[PDB]
RNA sequence: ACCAGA
RNA sequence: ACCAGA
RNA sequence: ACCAGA
RNA sequence: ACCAGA
């Protein structure tokens, strides 16, 4: 029986994360200065004016790659006291150097904001192609109370964080799903229902989160910082960690649903010998998933190299069995597109057959 | 059998609370000064006058967000000696900074109360839209005896704490349920039956408890402080912990009733293989429920991010089975609305069928 | 079988008493000075005169809340040497501060008693609405022998302690039950049969014990001190612990009779699966009942928050089965009112059917 | 909450 | 999220 | 890569 | 040495 433990150790080394800290520092890329307009000063009034001048900055076809990513990092961190020590706390991206600039309110400037460069800010912040709210009776969302801005900012962030859930997996067919979360935070009284940003504003951001990678690394790594906050989180931060249950494991559902339907049901069609090698390369992917730490449900949001390893192509037979168990059990699995060049529908029909045979067949 | 314990550890890490104390302090939100008018001095007379001038403050359409929340925190803590060291004892909310001000009685002021700012208090405390008692022959509820005020304050609090039970779950259809608790504390002689605040006063408060989150964090976290009081509690505090049995787990009844009817009855339709994966993701939610501590029955009152995890959408088949067992056993389960996009009524009809088949069928 | 012990631990934590000593001291209510006229000096004569001037104080419509409760605490502790070190020994109520004053006899005062304030006592102690004995040929019950006063005080206390048995559960229909205990202590020669206080005197006290809560906490917590007295108790104290067998568990008979008829009979209709979940939430209420200690039969006399947990609404089916077994077995169960909004008479008729089927049907 | 209990 | 619970 | 998830 | 592998 010496072949067995020599086989299991063979799959616990080729299916092992490589050890690190071997690069001396000659892998770091050419940097890229990005511009994140942080809120200026203690006062609430200028950070509501900053949010107003930076939401309509995004709804603009004339904004670039870095100017839009720095605009989003500028508004995804307005919910904290002193956002400057949050951006440099979170960003460990090696391709983007944060050069973040303070924005203070003024009555001299055209937009109303200067940089702490009085009119140079007006070329930073400035009709049928400007993205804005759906109730476009709105002109400005500048307020002066703290709990007003806390509910407006919580409304704007709650429909940028739900973009992250399927900006990279189902970008085009995300419009119906993300509305069902907007309905969720409206009846929870988390957000205000009036201030729904339109299809064209969100399609700027959803296309942006999909097309660059350092914006997603900022959006993921602050979520991981929200989770570590021990006590009662602040209420926008609780909302971001509430949206997070839709963002985790988003793009690993050829692996999560393989576990949920192929493994956990335990039909008699797992003792097939053709699965016996593929239950071990799925056992080792569950050992690998929990030793990657808290960055493991985001491996395809962060789009690292290790999500090729959790792909269903390494277990093409036991995955198809789990799609057969999956679409026969739930109504919700009927909408899942599983179109791959390794499908083998003879085990998909064997997956459905074990469910239909075991209808009233208590084990 | 190495796949089995590798599977169970996989569900005891993705269904695990994240470890904390990783934020250095850069998550804390922008603060918000709130105004909680605490009772002034040792004497009973000014805290009955404070209760009188602050109940009718709430029945007013001209009061704001923070002024109403500070009015409620002002009256939900009048039942203790020195309420100032209760508010700063309870409030660990990061979005609200308590600036609490002492209120002393006077004969110079219009309302009768000054701040320890003689007439500035009159703009703080001051007909068919002013909410007040149903027997609106009442003008004032200022008294001078201690046991009188102890019964009037116990009457006002006992119909604010029953608002919390379903302010966030069934806000609109709470009017018939909360009356059945008002009838309970009338025949127990806990409250006085005359001083029933009307529909329009309570709909200010029930809408308030629903729409902001730092008021609920104060209402929850003093309940958790009432429970820790070892000996005989004071009688208003015993009443709050008595109302508490209706506030606990309020919004988790897709999980509590899944345990009560799906699990604990133990019909032969739990050995279905389609439930075998969903009895383990319900076993791990019972491990998670008791290691969250004493803040776990209030997770949807506090509206944290972990009540998405106890949702019935993660076990959509075994939940529907338990609604089928549930509505067939009790008359009371017929009023429960369970309308979700994952219902699958083929197991709801299988849930009813196991009850009807097992009518006189002792195991 | 890992779901089973994970289920049983889930019900031994949500159905668990919360741990205590977490309040630093900021729960304690506003105090309330009460006036308990203790007997003055060693001599027997002034404590018989104190009892005389304080029984007719209670039969008076002009006495208040605190003056009546302090009058009752004044006479419920006359049976001990030095009653002053009994009141401050018993009262751990946080809402009532005992300010107890010594009463000495005199020939200068109108009532005959001064305070150790010669005429100020006459406004403390002073016809068809004055409650007094039924044989209202009696003018005074002042005596001079010790065994005379020991039998008069034992007569007055034995019809105040039987008020406590159902002052809070069946207040209105207690007049026929409490007479059957007065007949019991008359043929035992415990009391004197002549000195029966009338309906109108006792309806002052029974309404008082029902309407305030700190009087019941004094009446309960001295009963618990009577029980701890090791040797032969004094004879009035033996009588109070003799009345106590009617005061214990008074208001828990939807739980005691559920145990007595539903559980202990062990008909074949307990192996129903619909009861199998409700025999475990009744098993855990028997674990909870004996770890609450010696204050557990008085939880609804003390009216704490934990008697909502022993309510029949948490086991609405197995309770109705036990009312069906109950009213079919005894004549005495026919008088029990069990009218609740969770009755489900299909198991009440199933409860009666198991008794009628098992008539001469020895197991 | 409601019965009977020397 | 929605029932009943002295 | 694609579903559903108060 | 030769396949497939978001």
UniProtKB/TrEMBL annotation, chains A, B, C:
Gene Ontology molecular functions: RNA binding; structural molecule activity
GO CC list: helical viral capsid; host cell cytoplasm; host cell nucleus; ribonucleoprotein complex; viral nucleocapsid
Keyword rRNA-binding set for record: no
Localisation: Host nucleus; Virion; Host cytoplasm
Source species, domain of life: Viruses
Record has Thylakoid as a keyword: no
Primary location: host cell
The entry's keywords: Capsid protein, Helical capsid protein, Host cytoplasm, Host nucleus, Host-virus interaction, Phosphoprotein, Ribonucleoprotein, RNA-binding, Viral nucleoprotein, Virion
Chain's role: Forms the helical nucleocapsid (NC), protecting the genome from nucleases.
Subunit structure: Homomultimer; forms the nucleocapsid. Binds to the viral genomic RNA. N0 interacts with the phosphoprotein (via N-terminus); this interaction allows P to chaperon N0 to avoid N polymerization before encapsidation. Interacts as N-RNA template with the phosphoprotein (via C-terminus); this interaction positions the polymerase on the template.
Family to which the UniProt record says this protein belongs: Belongs to the paramyxoviruses nucleocapsid family.
Protein name in UniProt: Nucleocapsid
The organism's taxonomic lineage, starting at the top: Viruses, Riboviria, Orthornavirae, Negarnaviricota, Haploviricotina
Gene (name only): N
Whole-protein coverage range: 2 to 377 of 525
